[PDB]
Amino acid sequence: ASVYAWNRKRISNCVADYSVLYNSASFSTFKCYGVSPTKLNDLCFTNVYADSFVIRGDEVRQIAPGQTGKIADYNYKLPDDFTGCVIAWNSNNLDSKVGGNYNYLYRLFRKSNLKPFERDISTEIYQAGSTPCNGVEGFNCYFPLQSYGFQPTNGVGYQPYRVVVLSFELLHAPATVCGPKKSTNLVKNKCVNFNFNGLTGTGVLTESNKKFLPFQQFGRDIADTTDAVRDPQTLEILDITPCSFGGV
Amino acid sequence: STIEEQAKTFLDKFNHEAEDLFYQSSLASWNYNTNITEENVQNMNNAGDKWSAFLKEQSTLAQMYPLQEIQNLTVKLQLQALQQNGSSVLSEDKSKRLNTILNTMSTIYSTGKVCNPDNPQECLLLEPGLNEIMANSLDYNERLWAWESWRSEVGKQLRPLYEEYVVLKNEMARANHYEDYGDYWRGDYEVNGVDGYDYSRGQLIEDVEHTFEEIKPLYEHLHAYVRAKLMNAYPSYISPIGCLPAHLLGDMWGRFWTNLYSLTVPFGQKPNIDVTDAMVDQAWDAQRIFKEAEKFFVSVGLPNMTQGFWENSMLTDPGNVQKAVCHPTAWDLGKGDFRILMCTKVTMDDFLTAHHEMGHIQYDMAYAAQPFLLRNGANEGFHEAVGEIMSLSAATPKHLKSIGLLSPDFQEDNETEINFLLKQALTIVGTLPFTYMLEKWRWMVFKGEIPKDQWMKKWWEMKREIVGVVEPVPHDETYCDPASLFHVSNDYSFIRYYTRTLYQFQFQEALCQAAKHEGPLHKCDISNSTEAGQKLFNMLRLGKSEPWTLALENVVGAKNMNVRPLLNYFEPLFTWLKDQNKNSFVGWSTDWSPYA
Ligand SMILES: *[C@@H]1O[C@H](CO)[C@@H](O)[C@H](O)[C@H]1NC(C)=O
Ligand SMILES: *[C@@H]1O[C@H](CO)[C@@H](O)[C@H](O)[C@H]1NC(C)=O
Ligand SMILES: *[C@@H]1O[C@H](CO)[C@@H](O)[C@H](O)[C@H]1NC(C)=O
Ligand SMILES: *[C@@H]1O[C@H](CO)[C@@H](O)[C@H](O)[C@H]1NC(C)=O
Ligand SMILES: *[C@@H]1O[C@H](CO)[C@@H](O)[C@H](O)[C@H]1NC(C)=O
Ligand SMILES: *[C@@H]1O[C@H](CO)[C@@H](O)[C@H](O)[C@H]1NC(C)=O
Ligand SMILES: *[C@@H]1O[C@H](CO)[C@@H](O)[C@H](O)[C@H]1NC(C)=O
């Protein structure tokens, strides 16, 4: 969609890998605000809504928290202290056609500055002066919606850069999408520290004869001591015992 | 509820609309210069009419805005140019006389004819036929006929047409609240709205004339020396007491005296500064010729060239059916699209021309951030002078040895520098009197206080006095030779060339001083100097947003037109010329002797 008709979608309850994004070797203005890309996977937040639109290469910098301008003020406003990342890459080879790609429109005028995270679609027209416009364009009507021109021979600054926006916020709800925490292969008959899904400890991992019902995760015997954990990647229950220790 | 905000709203709307139409028109023009087809010319009218018609509609809308309440100067200049009525003031019956007259004269000038009367053997166009027979031959008899082959076969029919052109183009000045059509061209240099920095339209004439008093003494010795070397091949055919014939100045109009190298070589014993055989030995091509120019620009400090030109523009002559002209020109299509149109060749001039072309392209991106209306030079002279400063540095031996085109061991003696400096003066200093007189003739003739009969007698009198040329054969008033020149005939302001010399050298001294180069200016270089690049970039990016007069103060600090930093470049040459002209008759008065 175009900048004046940017979409807001919902993504939740799954796992997304941002590591592949970093080494995509295709992004030109991968910028993160309020969070480093490296620590974006270990910790996860809610409100992972995403936005998609097309922005010309020259005015890419306008899309940033605390940054105003034409697109940032009349088309899409980013709130201050924005917690998220913006990914942009060139799309010359496909987002362009001979004679000019007159398919993307943008807002050139507005009665008031756009508030952060506001979607504005309208047919009305601007009032430059005092005489109202009754739908007929005149000396002070200035139909705000103007179509972009993206020719294949346009300069790099004027090239239409394909850009998307990712945002993260807080809510009183369980955490939404996170990253996969690179589960490591197990080892048996060794005093090895373990960190399963939620619980962690140190002990010797051995075979077990007891049978768990299909809805348990870990087991304990006495005094809230965990001694039987079923790994999720194998669905096999294994005993846990503290390894050798004592006085000498 | 104010005019200032309303004007800003309109300008923003116009900027996005105008650039879109301009880009579509600009790209169409490039193709016609690379692939000419019978349908391409038909395409021009479809694109041209709407683009021109677009400005007409916008100009009317901008007229109702009063100009007495816009304190802002950025939009004040923009509204001034957008409100130029131009041909709108002319009536429909009178307006149709513009295109009808303009196009007919264009076709007439494009007809090359050197076929001998009563002897129709053959004759080619202007470029192949006219230039070769005058720039190479050394025969007085045929050259005189060649002089008459164009001033009596092409300009004769322009007398009833040119006169009609200046009577109706002079009327629009009153409708445009201007003094005359000549004064209209002076509006480019006019500055208003800034206290102390205002430049009156009439201030151009006095400033141009004031700087001409110091040019003449240099020209008196230059003309005295150049004429002395002309009688070596003509000891007695021309008397050494008057001026020189018009048809012995290299070109038909004598604008450039480059062709006089063979006849007037200062010291031909030692080899000249030529690297044509050097580059062919190393197998240079179009890509390498331009690439070495690009790294020269970035070394100075300016941003390097873009990426959408090598694979977008054309360098050599493509194909065989494509006969489109490839004259060296600068293309500014807008929206980040920039191209260069020229035919690469293994020649000295083309190598220098390559460095000259990128100068205009570099200036285009400097004011890219400026709006579409202000996306232009400060005045008509700035755009040309900016593109020539590097050409002077590119010809210096120091720059050539840096890349390796010149031999590693090339001594720099007295004669080596005088030979190089003198030729630059001929094509720069030599053409200054010719530029000034022609523009002065255009101003006075457009004023209207000149009867028909004395159009031509006054044209010749000052040429013999200022330029110093004797008429090869008397001509009566019916002839219209002054209208045969390319720029004057096709309605181009020739004053820009006169200011080109005064602008290129003023910046050269400032840039050379910024580089802290030790030595004379002729040996100065601009590369490997980041400080000089920053100084140039500061004024280039201003564009038309700031007054042109303010630009000068940012580089040389002199608000007026300073002619002093032009003799300094030729001080080694001037001293030698004075000694060489000890016996030559320096200083010519009115002279009817050669053709009494
Ligand atoms: C997912 O379950 C399949 C079921 O056989 C198993 O083969 C696979 O190893 C599991 N994934 C991981 C990462 O262990
Ligand atoms: C070039 O021009 C020729 C004829 O002038 C035409 O047949 C050909 O299609 C043109 N090619 C391009 C790429 O414009
Ligand atoms: C005029 O307005 C422009 C708006 O961008 C501003 O940049 C400039 O400084 C203003 N100049 C004056 C003299 O008010
Ligand atoms: C331009 O033409 C319009 C319409 O005739 C007129 O109102 C206006 O005064 C003219 N402006 C100039 C500068 O000639
Ligand atoms: C221009 O310089 C930049 C900065 O070093 C570089 O990335 C780019 O490739 C250069 N472009 C050309 C055409 O040399
Ligand atoms: C400029 O610097 C380069 C890099 O050292 C050098 O190769 C070149 O000869 C220098 N040119 C001049 C004129 O100093
Ligand atoms: C150049 O001229 C000066 C002044 O006469 C003289 O001293 C010097 O030797 C000359 N140099 C050469 C190389 O002729």
Q: Is B177 in the pocket of ligand 4 (CB under 6 A)?
A: yes
Cα-to-chain-centroid distance, residue B178: 25
- Contact criterion met (CB < 8 Å) for A151 and B23: yes
How many CB atoms sit inside 10 A of residue A44's CB? Answer: 15
With CB atoms and an 8 Å threshold, state whether A109 touches B9: yes
Contact B570, B217 (CB under 8 A): no
Contact A128 B9 (CB under 8 A): yes
The domain spans of chain B are 1-596
Q: What residue's CA is closest to ligand 4, atom 13? A: B176
Token pair listed for B69: 């309440």
Please tell me whether residue B342 adopts helix, strand or coil conformation. Answer: coil
Closest Cα to atom 14 of ligand 2: B35
Q: How far apart are CA A226 and CA A195, in angstroms?
A: 13
Q: Say how far apart CA A106 and CA A55 lie, in whole Å.
A: 9
Q: Which long-range contacts (CB under 8 A, 24 or more apart) does B186-194 make?
A: B188/B379, B188/B380, B188/B493, B189/B379, B189/B548, B191/B547, B191/B548, B191/B549, B193/B73, B193/B76, B194/B73, B194/B547, B194/B550
B308 vs A146, A149, A153: nearest CB: A153
The verdict on the CB of residue B414 being under 6 Å from ligand 7 is yes
Collapsed DSSP state (helix, strand, coil) of residue B199 = strand
For the beta carbon of residue B303, count every other beta carbon within 10 angstroms.
12
Cα(B190) to ligand 2 centroid in Å equals: 45
Between helix B38-63 and helix B3-32 the angle, nearest 10°, is: 170
Gap between the Cα atoms of B418 and B420, Å rounded: 5
Instruction: Name the residue among A142, A146, A155 with its Cβ closest to that of B336.
Output: A155
**Which ligand 6 atom lies nearest to the CA of residue B403?**
9
Confirm whether B487 is a catalytic residue. Answer: yes
Q: In sequence order, which residues have a C-beta less than 8 Å from that of residue A217 and are 6 or more positions away?
A: A196, A197, A198, A229, A230, A232
> Which residue has the CA at smallest separation from atom 6 of ligand 1?
A233
| Contacting residues of A for B312, CB less than 8 Å apart | 153
DSSP-H helix ranges across B448-490: 455-462, 486-489
One-letter amino acid at B287 equals Q
Task: Return d(Cα B385, Cα B377) in angstroms, integer.
Answer: 11
Q: B37 is written with which tokens?
A: 């087809």
* B304 touches ligand 5 (CB under 6 Å): yes
Nearest to B336 among A126, A140, A157 (CB): A157
The CA distances from residue A113 to A72, A110, B9, in Å, are 9, 7, 15
Count how many pairs of residues, chain A against chain B, have C-beta atoms within 8 Å: 58
B579 lines ligand 7 (CB under 6 A): no
Token output for B72? 């802002």
State the best of B3, B6, B8, B13 to mutate against chain A, taking most chain A CBs within 10 Å: B13
Unique residue bearing structure tokens 């979607």: A119
Instruction: Decide whether any atom of ligand 2 lies within 6 Å of the B276 Cβ.
Output: no
Burial class (CB in 10 A: 0-12, 13-18, 19+), B348: middle
Residues in chain A: 248
H helices present in B64-91, as ranges: 73-82
- Residue A90 forms contact with B (CB below 8 Å): no
Cα–Cα separations (whole angstroms), residue B327 to A8, B33, B324, B353, B364: 53, 9, 9, 11, 19
Nearest to B152 by CA among B475, B463, B432: B475
Beta strands at A84-90 and A160-167: parallel, antiparallel or unpaired: antiparallel
Q: Can you read off the two tokens belonging to residue A153?
A: 């021979």
Residue A158, chain B, CB below 8 Å: the answer is yes
Q: Is B221 a catalytic residue?
A: no
In order of A31, A201, B418, B484, the CA distances from A211 in angstroms are 50, 22, 105, 108
What resolution does the deposited structure have, in angstroms? Answer: 3.6
B312 close contact with A: CB closer than 8 A: yes
Task: Tell me whether residues B335 and A149 touch, CB distance under 8 A.
Answer: yes
**Nearest chain A Cα to B12, which residue?**
A108
How far, in Å, is the centroid of ligand 1 from the Cα of A173?
A: 29
Q: Which of B414, B415, B416 most suits a substitution to test ligand 7, by most atoms within 8 Å of the C-beta?
A: B414
Nearest to A139 among B23, B61, B368 (CB): B61
Considering the candidates B190, B357, B439, B509, report the single residue annotated as catalytic: B357
Ligand 7 close to Cβ of residue B52 (< 6 A)? no
**Do β-strands A84-90 and A145-147 pair in parallel, antiparallel, or remain unpaired?**
unpaired
Find out whether A6 and A52 touch, Cβ atoms under 8 Å. yes
- B119 secondary structure, DSSP code: B
Q: How many residues does chain B have?
A: 596
Query: CB distance B16–A108 less than 8 Å?
Result: yes
* Inter-chain touch A142–B13, beta carbons under 8 Å: yes
3-class secondary structure, B438: helix
Å from B326 to nearest chain A CA? 20
A109 in contact with chain B, both atoms CB, cutoff 8 A: yes
Q: Which ligand is the nearest neighbour of the Cα of B528? A: 6
Of A58, A139, A155, the CB nearest to B306: A155
The DSSP H or E segment spanning B331 is: strand B329-334
| Ligand 3 atom 11, closest CA | B72
**What separation in Å is there between the alpha carbon of B402 and the centre of ligand 6?**
6
Q: CA-CA distance, A162 to A54, in Å (whole number)?
A: 5
Return binding residues of B for chloride.
151, 459, 463
Task: Determine the Cα–Cα distance for residues B408 and B400; give it in Å rounded to an integer.
Answer: 10
CA distance B313 to B307: 11
- Beta carbons of B13 and A153 less than 8 Å apart: no
Distance CA A204, CA B497 (A): 92
Q: What angle do CA B204, B205, B207 make, to 5 degrees?
A: 65
A158 with B312: Cβ contact below 8 A: no
Determine contact, residues B126/B108, Cβ cutoff 8 Å.
Answer: no
CA A4 to chain centre: 21
Residue type, A117: F
d(C-alpha A42, C-alpha A23), whole Å: 17
Residue of B nearest to A154 (CA): B337
Q: Which residue, B415, B545, B533, is CA-closest to B76?
A: B545
Query: Among B74, B79, B373, B545, which residue has the most ligand 3 atoms within 8 Å of its CB, making it the best to mutate?
Result: B74
Q: Pick from A129, A154, A155: which is nearest to B6 by CB?
A: A129
B307 touches chain A (CB under 8 A): yes
Structure tokens at B170: 């002079």
8 A C-beta contact, residue B75 and residue B545: no
Q: Which residue, by CA, sits nearest to atom 5 of ligand 4?
A: B89
- CA distance readout (Å), B435 to B212, B247, B500, B501: 11, 17, 11, 11
E strands present in chain A: 7-9, 31-33, 50-56, 84-90, 105-107, 145-147, 160-167, 191-195, 200-207, 218-220, 226-231, 236-241
Indicate the SS3 state at residue B168. helix
Give B531-567 as a DSSP string: HHHHHHHHHHTTTTSS-HHHHHHTTT--SS---HHHH
Which entry of B294, B465, B487, B517 is annotated as an active-site residue?
B487
Distance from CA of A130 to the nearest CA of B (A): 7
The rounded distance, in Å, linking the Cα atoms of B6 and B310 is 43
Q: How far apart are CA B291 and CA B284, in angstroms?
A: 11
Q: How far apart are the first and last CA of chain A?
A: 73
Q: Minimal Cα distance from B61: which residue of A?
A: A139
Q: CB contact, 8 Å: A93 with chain B? A: no
